[PDB]
């Protein structure tokens, strides 16, 4: 039984997409204002309606007869506007805008912490006396033609509250930077954002790697209290974990999940490894219409027959207003194609990104890292959607050549992996508390008898071994950490009747009732190296005895993903 503190690092992101302004178009900017050759320009919006505008702000109500004005800290909120769909006339609009010190980011995925209970965001600052005071300015705008005249009336029309938030983007990144030059300027208004690649993290299956097996350096011990004779002898090539996996598969069902031992099986989606591509069902078009039904109307006047003229068409407005709105012909509407877009998004999101690195190319005007293992490098590369589009291997059940040798369990639909990641919560700092089983075959089912024993074991603290990670970031670089707090050992006793237990012990100490135990894998394991672009591997075994053989079983691995069991710590193992 183990408890402690786990820190999954700043490259933990368990959800696709983003979480702020997700509905916004991916290019629309924020209300901003910048400098040019030196003058200032302003771009923004003003949704709120009011009554009257003076130099104190914008009236929003009457308290008795005295006007009541806006509260410049959180007044007119960004999410309050008009309600009727059909446009009317407003003369005293107001809105918010960001000062020119704050950097410009697209609306998509933009966050800034609140700074007062009412819900307004604005950097508080120190006053001369010890005190925190907000700083929001007001800027007034009038019609061009009105100023193009005389200041007889020159009443303002729009009011903007300018502030400066502590903007930041926690999960998106820029996919297009028009100009390298820094600072605020006209160009940067064109940039676009996109979300970061999802990346889970968790403990492994059955807590592999948390305990030291098959390492005669740190072998475990179970022995009689006074004999001090070890009962566990382990060789450097009796692989144990894989045997436990196979045994668990053999004796029972496997698709089910048991939370106690963290028992979930890694698996890929049956439709990502192989691409059944049927195309899309899009016989009908799927238009979209104007909010108001029709917006291209024209004005008309009622006319009524005359009398005694055979055409006398004369005007008539005694009852009907002379101006009425009417649309001739069909109504304006734009078109889309649904299923094609959905299928294309699926293909790009699940296959296009996971291609081998040699096909991608570094972006432009964006700084990137150098360790091709870091999350930053894996995230800031770009891949043309032309490689895997909605027209690849049409009508065929087939899998792409490149994606054949790429590990398919390192993915973000590995249901076991996402389950094990959610089982610890969605945060970054986790106080964890788990129970770990025992897997050595000579003591897995041994039935002990009265006495005193010494039982000692070893556990790893390396982060690349005990935590998985759907991608492979070398987690030692990415600041992951794990600290143990305390350990305890649990045991359960059957409350057997005393004399019966004595009889059982006496019978079981006779040397003809000893116990027999057999490993499940029951084999000797050897690994040989294969250099790049090789085609022929010969191996040899010198003369020896071959009594009671059983057979061979082989497979093939990548060197990049195989730790050097047999020493305390392998610093040359950067994958996960």
């Amino acid at each position: 039984d183990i408890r402690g503190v786990l820190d999954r690092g700043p490259t933990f992101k368990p959800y696709s997409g983003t979480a702020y302004n997700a509905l916004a178009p991916k290019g629309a900017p924020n209300p901003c204002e910048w400098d040019e050759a030196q003058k200032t320009h302003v771009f923004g919006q003003a949704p709120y309606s009011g009554i009257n505008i003076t130099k104190e702000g914008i009236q929003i109500g009457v308290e008795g007869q005295t006007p009541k004005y806006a509260d410049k800290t959180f007044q007119p909120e960004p999410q309050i506007g008009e309600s009727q769909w059909y446009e009317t006339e407003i003369n005293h609009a107001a809105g918010r805008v960001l000062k020119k010190t704050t950097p410009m980011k697209p609306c998509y995925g933009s966050y800034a912490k609140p700074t007062n209970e009412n819900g307004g965001q604005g950097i508080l600052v120190k006053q001369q006396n010890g005190k925190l005071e907000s700083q929001v300015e007001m800027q007034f705008f009038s019609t061009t033609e009105a100023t193009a005249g005389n200041g007889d009336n020159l009443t303002p029309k729009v009011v903007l509250y300018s502030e400066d938030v502590d903007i930041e983007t926690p999960d998106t990144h820029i996919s297009y930077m028009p100009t390298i030059k820094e600072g605020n300027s006209r160009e940067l208004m064109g940039q676009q954002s996109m979300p970061n690649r999802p990346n889970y993290i968790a403990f492994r299956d059955n807590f592999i790697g948390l305990m030291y097996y098959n390492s005669t350096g740190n072998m475990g011990v179970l022995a009689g209290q006074a004999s001090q004779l070890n009962a566990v002898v382990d060789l450097q090539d009796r692989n144990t974990e894989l045997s436990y996996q196979l045994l668990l598969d053999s004796i029972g069902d496997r698709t089910r999940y048991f939370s106690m031992w963290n028992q979930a099986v890694d698996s890929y989606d049956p439709d990502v490894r192989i691409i059944e591509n049927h195309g899309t069902e899009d016989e009908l078009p799927n238009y979209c219409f104007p909010l108001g039904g029709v917006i291209n109307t024209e004005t008309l006047t009622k006319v009524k027959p005359k009398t005694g003229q055979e055409n006398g068409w004369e005007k008539d407005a005694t009852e009907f207003s002379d101006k009425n709105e009417i649309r001739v012909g069909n109504n304006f509407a734009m078109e889309i194609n649904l299923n094609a877009n959905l299928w294309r998004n699926f293909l790009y999101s699940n296959i296009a990104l996971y291609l081998p690195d040699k096909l991608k190319y570094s972006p432009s005007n964006v700084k990137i890292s150098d360790n091709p293992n870091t999350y930053d490098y894996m995230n800031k590369r770009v891949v043309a959607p032309g490689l895997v589009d909605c027209y690849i291997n049409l009508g065929a059940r087939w899998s792409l050549d490149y994606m054949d040798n790429v590990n398919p369990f390192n993915h973000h639909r590995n249901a076991g992996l996402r389950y094990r990641s959610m089982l610890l919560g969605n945060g970054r700092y986790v106080p964890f508390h788990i129970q770990v089983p025992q897997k050595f075959f000579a003591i897995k089912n041994l039935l002990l008898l009265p006495g005193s024993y010494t039982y000692e074991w070893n556990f790893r603290k390396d982060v690349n071994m005990v935590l998985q990670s759907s991608l492979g970031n070398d987690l030692r670089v990415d600041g992951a950490s794990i600290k143990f707090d305390s350990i305890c050992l649990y045991a359960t006793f059957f409350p057997m009747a005393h004399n019966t237990a004595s009889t059982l012990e006496a019978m079981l100490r006779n040397d003809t009732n000893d116990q027999s135990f057999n490993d499940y894998l029951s084999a000797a394991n050897m690994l040989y190296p294969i250099p790049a672009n090789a085609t022929n591997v010969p191996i040899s075994i010198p003369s020896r005895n071959w009594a009671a053989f059983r057979g061979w079983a082989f497979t093939r691995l990548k060197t990049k993903e195989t730790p050097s069991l047999g020493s305390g710590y392998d610093p040359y193992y950067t994958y996960s």
């Binding site: 992101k13 979480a19 997700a22 949704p47 609140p114 028992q263 610890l424 409350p495």
Partner: protein, 249 residues
């Protein structure tokens, strides 16, 4: 709606907190110091100091062991997934769900600012205001919810709970909480069948703002015998013990 008392659709098992049982008002029946806690079965802990939770949830170990025993005779030789045919729809293991999450720690994060529902303006400019009506407002950086990932994350605390519906809670009246036959070994012992006793149970549950009912099933023996001595005549005899109901000459 669906009546749980008739068609067996229960959804409130996760609100019990502890149970205590006493015979004759002074003798506790876990018996002879069995359980980890001294005198009662604890079915969920909020604050733990000595680490008695299991399965990465908030269920004491015990209760987990008691349920696994009384449903599958599993637990004295290690826990494992029971077979499919011994795990029906209404069983216990099919209907266990542990869940956990993290939230912002107000007392520790030095910039905490409680924001109600009326002043959260995420996704501001393309969605209605406190209604599913037409869109409104302008675009602006959002202020909700606090990030929990990335390099600028906030401090946090953890909450854990479990969900277990569609099943009753069980406690068998055996000596070692096993199912060794219909007529248990403690239902035959002279002490519980050649004298009398008084029973006291005490439940402690979490509060809800609505009148409720506690549903108790005492498992007993109920048997009918049927005899047909002639043409068109049928006699019957009923027995139900312990909670007897019948005449006596």
């Amino acid at each position: 709606g669906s009546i749980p008392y008739l068609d067996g659709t229960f959804y409130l098992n996760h609100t019990f907190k502890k149970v205590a049982i006493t015979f004759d008002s002074s003798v506790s029946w876990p018996g002879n110091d069995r359980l980890l806690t001294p005198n009662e079965f604890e079915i969920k802990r909020s604050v733990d100091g000595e680490g008695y939770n299991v399965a990465q949830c908030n269920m004491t170990k015990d209760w987990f062991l008691v349920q696994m025993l009384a449903n599958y005779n599993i637990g004295y030789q290690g826990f494992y997934i029971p077979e499919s045919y011994k795990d029906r729809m209404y069983s216990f293991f099919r209907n266990f769900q542990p869940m956990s999450r993290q939230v912002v720690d107000d007392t520790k994060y030095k910039d905490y600012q409680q924001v109600g529902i009326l002043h959260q303006h995420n996704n501001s400019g393309f969605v209605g205001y406190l209604a599913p009506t037409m869109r409104e407002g302008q675009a602006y950086p959002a202020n909700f919810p606090y990030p929990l990932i990335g390099k600028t994350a906030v401090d946090s605390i953890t909450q854990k709970k479990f969900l277990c519906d569609r099943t009753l809670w069980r406690i068998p009246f055996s000596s070692n909480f096993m199912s060794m036959g219909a007529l248990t070994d403690l239902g035959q012992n002279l002490l519980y069948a050649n004298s009398a006793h008084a029973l006291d149970m005490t439940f402690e549950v979490d509060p809800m703002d609505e009148p409720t009912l506690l549903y108790v099933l005492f498992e007993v023996f109920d048997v009918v015998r049927v005899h047909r001595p002639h043409r068109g005549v049928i006699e019957t005899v009923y027995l139900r013990t312990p909670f007897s109901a019948g005449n006596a000459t």
